[model samples]
Target: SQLEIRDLWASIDGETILKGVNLVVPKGEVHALMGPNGAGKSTLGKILAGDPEYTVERGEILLDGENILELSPDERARKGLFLAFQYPVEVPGVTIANFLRLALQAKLGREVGVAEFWTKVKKALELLDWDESYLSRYLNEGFSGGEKKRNEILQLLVLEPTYAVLDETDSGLDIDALKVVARGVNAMRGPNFGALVITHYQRILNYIQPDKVHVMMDGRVVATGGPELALELEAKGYEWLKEKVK
Candidate 1:
């Protein structure tokens, strides 16, 4: 199903961050959401993931035609909506294997046998060009920034969420790591998935090549166009966009 945001207004502690933000990421397509720092990109992604710290004054977040504004974060995940964070948190006591296994079990409402689980995870590992040994490590405990980003995509590939918001995944990735992440994402591209790749640079876009590009300014989306828009923004930066939107 597709994701629909209609006239969304959200704030943290009464300080507005999203002002009537409206956008749609249709099923089977990948869209890019880009903006300069403080443009509310991360806030929008966090709200969609059901972060409790923020308040929504008005709007609807429709996933598969159902309003999910009130759902808890876990509830939203089970419903096939996913949000990858800019900074993935570390879980010192949990191994990546157990964490993902538990998550899969909860999401699917069934016992995912080790064999069944390995089969799925193995494919994702190969797609990511990551070693199988990685699964046994403590989740993000000692991961480098690039490793954390890869783990985020690893979760994305295994979870197979219907709609995903990748909040600044390109932030600290090197060119090689960026391509690996893009490859994992590209592998999932097709009729059953949709993604929002949020970033400030066009480097990752070179590999991912989103079908649509949306430019966010202040608290609203000021422009939307084809892939070329990302290139234009790359060359001219946000000043050009500001002039046009003004």
Candidate 2:
């Protein structure tokens, strides 16, 4: 497994959120998890990405067979773990070009020359139909909802992590930006990468089309099924899943 979570028990400020979460993401595979609000779906993604706000009472999180609970955020990233946040940050002075290069160099453990880096950035920007001028702007600062999300996928394209956990990267996107994000994701598909896309809406899934689907409820995965499961959930809603799981 590229990523695995076992018996995860966690909470914030002394109230438990994740009772016992277990999940696995095999290399070169994609999984989409759908659920109602407060299902602890986002909590799971946070734990995997080493969110210190929540304390884990038990269980293990492993990245490529290494125990990651003891590692810091940058440490995990150096080992090829990436998280596409639902809410991207905004730093007034940090330009997207500089921030991305810094992150890539950190992951690569060396300097990235301007020539090669710019070439790659240009390709990704062209693929997404994003303007080169946007790279010179502050990171997600004053960016529209869609622009922020597109910026994230642009980072994903540049960084090329071995495994990526996309936390609702589809939300707040218009149809056009949604396709742009999907195009970046689609172009990166290959045998060397794995993805776990967390989404609330089925709209973007129509473009990315995950290989497997898991339905989560109350901090646990109530059901796991194939591609068709998403369609069923979108059409029938979580009412059926809630009844079955409860």
Candidate 3:
């Protein structure tokens, strides 16, 4: 497994957010996590990414057979774990290129010489069809929704983590922009890269075509199925799933 969440338990402010959530994302495969609002979907995504605020009270989160629960976010990141936030943070003065450079250096555990950094960044920009000028823009600041999502995927491509969790990456996108973001993800995907796309709707799935699907309810994975589960959830909504799970 690329990453495994085995009987994971987490909480915030003494209120539980994830109750025994279990999942396995193997390298090179996509898993679509489908759930309605209040299903703790975002919480699970955050915890796996090493969010500081929430507490993991039980269970193991292993990345490539190594337990990652004890590592800090940066440590986990250095070990090749990444997440595209549902709400990407806006930093006023941090240019995208500079931020990514620093992050890449940290992830590599040493200084990434500027020349090497530029070569990598240039290749990624070309791959995504992004203008070199966009690299100087502040991270996510004043960017349109599509731009934000695309920016996240740009990081995904550059970081090249073993496993990635995309937290509701499809929201607030127009049809055309959505296509662009999905295409970027597909372009970056390969045998060593796995992704978990957490989504509330099936629209993005139509573009990415996940290999497996899971439905989350009340902080638990109430059902696990195949790609068709996404289409089923789109047709029936969570009401039917809720009834069926009970």
Q: Rate the local accuracy (lDDT) of all candidates.
A: 0.84, 0.80, 0.81
lDDT of 3: 0.81
Q: Highest TM-score: give the candidate number.
A: 1
| lDDT accuracy of residue 231 in candidate 2 | 86
For model 3, how does the per-residue alpha-carbon lDDT over 1-246 read when each residue is reduced to its tens digit?
588889988999999889999989888888888888678998888788777899999999899999998998877887788844343465468788887787677677789888988898888888888799988888867667766776777777777788888866447346776677677668767898888888888888889889899889999899988888889888998898889878
| lDDT for each residue of candidate 1 in 1-246, tens digit (9 for 90 to 100) | 788888999999889999988889999999998988689888888889888899999999999999999998778887889744232464467778887887677777799999989999999888777799989888778667676777778878888889888766446447876776688779889899988988888788999999999889998899999999999998999988999887
Off by over 4 Å in 1: 83-94, 169-173
Model 1 is weakest, by summed lDDT over 10 consecutive residues, at: 83-92
- Candidate 2 pairs with clashing backbones: none
TM per prediction: 0.90, 0.87, 0.88
Angstrom error of the Cα, residue 85, model 3: value is 10
lDDT order of candidates, top first: 1, 3, 2
lDDT of 2 by residue, 126-213 (tens): 7777789988988767667777777778889888888888777436446876676678777777888888888766777889889888
Model 2 worst lDDT run, 10 consecutive residues: 83-92
